[PDB]
Design a protein around this ligand. Structure first.
Ligand SMILES: O=C(COc1ccc(Cl)cc1)Nc1ccccc1C(=O)O
Length: 559
């Protein structure tokens, strides 16, 4: 069936949209070519709708069914519990979209009389009605990027599709536990969200060394969400049902599936009807989990339809990477062809055709790759890096304009070992926070879809905990990585690494002169900037688990 049926009504903004870098005094200190940093808006939604709309075809295999059965067998190992309205209410982000029925996220968090009651009726309703499609709103996301390599190329807005607040709270009550528990049990170590960046690099590096003759590849499917068939959503519903669940939970989950997850009517911000969705919704609590289970089911099947080798996959929603035993150059290449044919047959066709790689550092999944550096003791150390462009792009925007979720902080957390995060992002923002006396101010950032409130002065403890003390000592970065950064610094008009050294010696000096927590930030985060480096002892006050358990992208999770 068609992933989308449109009425011709337009996907419309709810708030004025800014599309250009709101240039600043401070902003210009970070980036110069402010005319290569845009933000997506409603304007380009028509384009997105065209790319994301298409007919789907699926042809299941015995390979597919065998894997489904194993998954199910494994799923029937889990016992999930239903959340109390209190529990589900607390997990709601403070800024969450207000309900069309009078109350808001603030009321939900306070357990307001009217809030809980609407929630209680949406629940009762779900239990009584298992057929009326539930209404959802469709919006065009406002994310910023840097202009496509070639001067021109812009990204057309991504589309978010979500139900009413009251429903969202109901999703938490019935599936939150399933969604942060079942995925790992079913896919074991293949479940990507159970790892912190360091753990991911360790799993990829060892899996690569474990192979006698290693081959690896990342698979990029086109509009995964659109490729998700109604049947895919029901199959995934059956996997949740394999858990030991409460009678009401099975009922709430069965209904959410038939009324919301399988598909439903789309409504723009002006209450106008936009069309109908017969695929995954980017804005529900199961988007991430559904996508990971489904992507994993197809990829695994697709592996059997090829490899006579020892596959190890890492799956993060629609992101996939497999490392197996090479069977030779021309033979491996054949295998990926079959793999792609298999995946396409399951309604998961490729954007770019997958390419056999024989160098782990050349593989990129989750827009990241493994790279090598050295720690204080000279030892070789692997860490996860990224192409700094979007992070730098979004840092500039976040300097010039006030954002609800700020990526610079999350990038620092996810990429504390990189030379760009360490030298530019850290140096830039601690400088700003210093100037404006905002060091104690908790800020909101996101990890694996979930929103968190982090105090920038904890970065040290946080980083040692996730990356280890060595995140403060890496120094012999790859000629490759170094060029990548410098080259991007060129393109964006970001001052050279050499300037960041000086700036950071300054920032490190200010932090120190305030002792306590800022000095700790100065002592550990900028030890790289000083000439005569001083040794760093395991941070005492640094001894987070709920941080890398599961994925909640599009979900409505707060912590
Ligand atoms: O750029 C990426 C690409 O995604 C990953 C990076 C590292 C790991 Cl271990 C997994 C996904 N991630 C982020 C960057 C800043 C903040 C949050 C995130 C996130 O994935 O939650």
């Amino acid at each position: 069936s068609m992933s989308y049926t449109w009425t011709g009504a337009l996907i419309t903004p709810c708030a004025a949209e800014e599309s250009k870098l709101p240039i600043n005094a401070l902003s210009n200190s970070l980036l110069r070519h402010h005319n290569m940093v845009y933000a997506t808006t409603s304007r380009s939604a028509g384009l997105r709708q065209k790319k994301v709309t298409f007919d789907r075809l699926q042809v299941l295999d015995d390979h597919y069914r065998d894997v489904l059965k194993e998954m199910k067998a494994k799923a029937s190992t889990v016992k999930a519990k239903l959340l109390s309205v209190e529990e589900a209410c607390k997990l709601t982000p403070p800024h969450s979209a207000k309900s069309k029925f009078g109350y808001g996220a603030k009321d939900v968090r306070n357990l307001s009389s009217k809030a809980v009651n609407h929630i209680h009726s949406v629940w009762k309703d779900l239990l009584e009605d298992t057929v009326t499609p539930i209404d959802t709103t469709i919006m065009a996301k406002n994310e910023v990027f840097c202009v496509q390599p070639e001067k021109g190329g812009r990204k057309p807005a991504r589309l978010i599709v979500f139900p009413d607040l009251g429903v969202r709270v109901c999703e938490k009550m019935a599936l939150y536990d399933v969604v942060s528990t079942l995925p790992q049990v079913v896919m074991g170590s293949s479940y990507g969200f159970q790892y912190s960046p360091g753990q991911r690099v360790e799993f990829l590096v060892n899996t690569w060394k474990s192979k006698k003759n290693p081959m690896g590849f990342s698979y990029d499917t086109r509009c995964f969400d659109s490729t998700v068939t109604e049947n895919d959503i029901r199959v995934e519903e059956s996997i949740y049902q394999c858990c030991d669940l409460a009678p009401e939970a099975r009922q709430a989950i069965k209904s959410l599936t038939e009324r919301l997850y399988i598909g439903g009517p789309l409504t723009n911000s002006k209450g106008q009807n936009c069309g109908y969705r017969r695929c995954r919704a980017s804005g529900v609590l199961t988007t991430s989990c559904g996508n990971t289970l489904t992507c994993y089911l197809k990829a695994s099947a697709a592996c059997r339809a090829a490899k006579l080798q020892d596959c190890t996959m890492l799956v993060n929603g629609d992101d996939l990477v497999v490392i197996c035993e090479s069977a030779g150059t021309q033979e491996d290449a054949a295998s990926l062809r079959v793999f792609t044919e298999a995946m396409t047959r399951y309604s998961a066709p490729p954007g770019d055709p997958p390419q056999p790689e024989y160098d782990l550092e050349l593989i990129t999944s989750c827009s990241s790759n493994v790279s090598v550096a050295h720690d204080a003791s000279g030892k070789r150390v692997y860490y996860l890096t990224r192409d700094p462009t979007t992070p730098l792009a979004r840092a500039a925007w976040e300097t010039a304009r006030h954002t609800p979720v700020n990526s610079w902080l999350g990038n620092i957390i996810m990429y504390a070992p990189t030379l760009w995060a360490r030298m530019i992002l850290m140096t830039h923002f601690f400088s700003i926070l210093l100037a404006q006396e905002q060091l104690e101010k908790a800020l909101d950032c996101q990890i694996y879809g979930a929103c968190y409130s982090i105090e920038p002065l904890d970065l040290p403890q946080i980083i040692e905990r996730l990356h280890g003390l060595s995140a403060f000592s890496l120094h012999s970065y790859s000629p490759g990585e170094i060029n990548r950064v410098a080259s991007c610094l060129r393109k964006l008009g970001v001052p050279p690494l050499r300037v960041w050294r000086h700036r950071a010696r300054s920032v490190r000096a200010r932090l120190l002169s305030q002792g306590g927590r800022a000095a700790t930030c100065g002592k550990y985060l900028f030890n790289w900037a000083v000439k005569t480096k001083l040794k760093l002892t395991p941070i005492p006050a640094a001894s987070l688990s709920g941080w890398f358990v599961a994925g909640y992208s599009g979900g409505d999770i707060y912590h």
